[PDB]
């Protein structure tokens, strides 16, 4: 059976969108869909994932195919020009 890897990203506002683990693709591109589907932007959003009872912040250049099997969650970095 064709193996399907995904990462379930918990979007802002406690929603979630899953993105198929893209090999050779960064959190940037994968999450780019994730945010954009909600109408949000990866610019003012951060990627975190919970490890041993704690939080580990993720880098946008991180190959998302390592993060397969995990549930992610994005943290809104509110630094708007307001
Ligand atoms: C890899 O194989 C897939 C098969 C799919 O289908 C057969 C979808 C399908 C996606 S989709 O068209 O359902 C848009 C989508 C997906 C998940 C969501 O939450 C978990 C939301 N949440 C939106 C909200 O709640 O605001 C939106 C896929 O997506 C990556 C992957």
């Amino acid at each position: 059976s064709p193996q399907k890897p995904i990462v379930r990203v918990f979007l802002p506002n406690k929603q979630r969108t899953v993105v198929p683990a893209r090999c050779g693709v960064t959190v940037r591109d994968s999450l780019k869909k994730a945010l954009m589907m909600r109408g949000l932007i990866p610019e003012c959003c951060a990627v975190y994932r919970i490890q041993d009872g704690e939080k580990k912040p993720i880098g946008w250049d991180t190959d998302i195919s390592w993060l397969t099997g995990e549930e992610l969650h994005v943290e809104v970095l509110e630094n708007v020009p307001l």
Side-chain angles (χ1 to χ4, degrees):
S1 183
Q3 190 68 268
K4 177 274 299 180
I6 47 78
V7 186
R8 291 168 188 156
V9 172
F10 286 53
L11 316 153
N13 291 86
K14 292 295 296 185
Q15 265 174 330
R16 72 179 187 182
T17 245
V18 358
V19 52
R22 292 305 73 177
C23 50
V25 176
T26 53
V27 189
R28 173 56 184 202
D29 215 77
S30 41
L31 271 282
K32 122 198 303 179
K33 176 200 60 172
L35 279 323
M36 280 267 64
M37 290 207 296
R38 296 286 57 249
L40 280 69
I41 59 176
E43 310 283 69
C44 303
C45 298
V47 184
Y48 270 78
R49 80 302 182 164
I50 299 301
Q51 206 175 331
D52 190 82
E54 70 181 295
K55 301 175 59 156
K56 299 299 186 68
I58 298 156
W60 290 102
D61 71 282
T62 292
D63 181 271
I64 175 183
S65 284
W66 294 321
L67 288 60
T68 326
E70 294 292 280
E71 294 177 294
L72 297 188
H73 64 99
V74 178
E75 313 291 88
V76 290
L77 306 151
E78 297 179 83
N79 287 145
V80 286
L82 197 165

